[PDB]
Symmetry: D2
Subunit: 213 residues, 4 copies
């Protein structure tokens, strides 16, 4: 049975780079995709195929993609279950023009350890109860917001007003209502994110031992 | 201005604390006045005159204007004591170009209500014991950072990376160490800032009652 | 139209005693029952009449009376709407033996000012939209727990193990899940409770100005 | 050189039970004192010898043993730098009558891993910089007071009003002003405490890895 690590934290907490760094340090980027012992899954792969009335809100730009409802809880639960039972799985690739899933999927061969990472990884009891270990990457919201702003201006061509409109109207309230109340389910809290080498090495070491048990 | 009623106002940068003070005095028409019964004092007037070592620091972005050390606590305590005793006082006018006070001082005559506003208004016990009412304008750090970034870009012409580098290195550590722990000393907390018209009307109504 | 003030806070915040002290400082204990210009309603008077399955849970000490499910929001809504229409209204008296309402109701005549006070006074949009002013009495959970333990040994006949088991299992999670998030709806936050005479005198003076 | 783990968190966070459990799961409770590879040091062992002035405050129940000033940072620093140099060390044992150190000491032979555990283990930069790993046991203040009351009420036998007056007056203010600001120096935060078996087993394993 594969070892499931759930990782949560708000946007730009560093939950993504933490998963990236752990997997890099375990030599997994030098390993072919068919033979990887440690795989990373993101909750944002499992965005819902939107209905007519949902797609209408999304064109008007008034659909909160950080709300639990924007996420396909039942496909997440189904898929993680299959992973647990040792089965290989298909991860969707999301089209934001059509708010539907493309035909091309991503294949995920049975792994020894699976990192499942997202803003609402711990929101559903049934999904929480599949994780052997729960990690929350705790970064102050002001810190996270500065990171969000530099990232979205630099590697995307997004405008500063639009970024802070979306943050204040949608991201912040959804973080406070749905994500932050899930911090209390975490086994281990990792402050600051990917620059926290002591916490990362501690989780790398732990996965390393698992790969040799 | 027999025995002024001193109101202390704190809260982080971009909390709303200046606008709240400004709206309170506006809604009282004590705006456009010569017999001002309500005046606003700002802790921003009481910056220390800098050494040339410190002036040199300020030219680079590396002098912490959010630290207690950057404000003249002795002159603030003295100025507020004289106000409490019903005396006319001189407020400095600070020139940032020279990092020193001009000859021009602003004359504040005994008012019936004095609103003293600053990030560190409640930091010193001697100063905080002169306030008969202490207000804290409580606004979330991410909200406050959003307002600060937009003001610094759009009014003040700042570089984005410099704003946020300075935020992380100096402003945030200074707010968490020195300002945020003073919130417990507040009698009343005003969430959000200048848009809190219910909070603001409660403070204008209360100021009119003691003007009578 | 009566002026409606909603008042929330965790258990042992001091919301009850803040209300009680505001009324008494107004002189409204020396005013006659039918002539009360300012009255206090408690969300407590409006516990639901429990189902059979809820009765069962309650008798085994497994029903959370701090959950929104415990409160009769429809009756709360109805009674506040009628008070805004200037009606005389009847308030239920709850009985914890039967988990139901006594025949005895309590009569409240039209007041100028109504204080409504409860852990979940701001939980429901339609109820919170009836308040002209929302006060949240903000007292640290460790402080409030200190008060609860001393209150429950003296008043009730309870031991530490029962008070703390109940607090950890029921009061705390319900407070964090349901009460704490409503704080963002307050217009004014009152730290500490009824020893905050500056905050209390402020609400008193505001209420006096309504009565004039 | 030996591996120094610093552990902090508020009174009754569980940091002491976390250290006990880690050592119990590594089989060190069986190993002979002279051959122990993992040892727990407590900051509580390094209380300062009080001056007459402080001894005077302490007799009147006014010396705050949770204030940084109550810890002998110089002795802590010396003792940990010695452990780091491979040297055998004596740990004081304290008398809370004379507010000074007994005849008897406790000998600690060079260990491969030291857990240094206390409320202010990260307060001093010099102490904090010795630790290759910093753990902070984060337990809610209302939860910690719960445990503290039950623990203290017997283990010492003392009165309930005294435990709670002491907590509100001394412990809570000292935790909020001095301990809580040290959380940002933790590499890893362990929630709830000794019942967190995932977090405990993660640390046990890391230490086993180090001993092999
Ligand atoms: O001041 C701080 C940073 S804690 C903090 N609180 C925030 C931020 C943004 N919004 N809020 C906030 C939101 C809703 C509220 F209702 C209250 C605050 C933020 O960046 N940091 N110190 C701190 C750091 C870690 C811990 Br754990 C606790 C306090
Ligand atoms: O006590 C407080 C704020 S109010 C508060 N919140 C608490 C306490 C204990 N647990 N929580 C809590 C835990 C999880 C939640 F989701 C919500 C609440 C507490 O004593 N006070 N902090 C404080 C006060 C003064 C200073 Br100075 C610094 C920090």
């Amino acid at each position: 049975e594969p070892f499931l690590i759930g990782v949560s934290g708000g946007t730009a907490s560093g939950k993504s780079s933490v998963c990236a760094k752990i997997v890099q340090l375990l030599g997994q980027n030098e390993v072919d995709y068919r033979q990887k012992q440690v795989v990373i899954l993101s909750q944002d792969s499992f965005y819902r195929v939107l209905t007519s009335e949902q797609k209408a809100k999304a064109l008007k730009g008034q659909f909160n993609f950080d709300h639990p409802d924007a996420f396909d809880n039942e496909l997440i639960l189904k898929t993680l279950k299959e992973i647990t039972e040792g089965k290989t799985v298909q991860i969707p690739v999301y089209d934001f023009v059509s708010h539907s899933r493309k035909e091309e999927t991503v294949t995920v061969y049975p792994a020894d350890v699976v990192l499942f990472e997202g803003i609402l990884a711990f929101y559903s009891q049934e999904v929480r109860d599949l994780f052997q270990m729960k990690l929350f990457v705790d970064t102050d919201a002001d810190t996270r917001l500065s990171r969000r702003v530099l990232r979205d201006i630099s590697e995307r061509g997004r405008d500063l007003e639009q970024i802070l409109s979306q943050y204040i109207t949608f991201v912040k309230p959804a973080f406070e209502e749905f994500c932050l109340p899930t911090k209390k389910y975490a086994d281990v809290i990792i402050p600051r994110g990917a620059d926290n080498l002591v916490a990362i090495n501690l989780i790398v070491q732990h996965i390393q031992d698992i790969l040799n048990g």
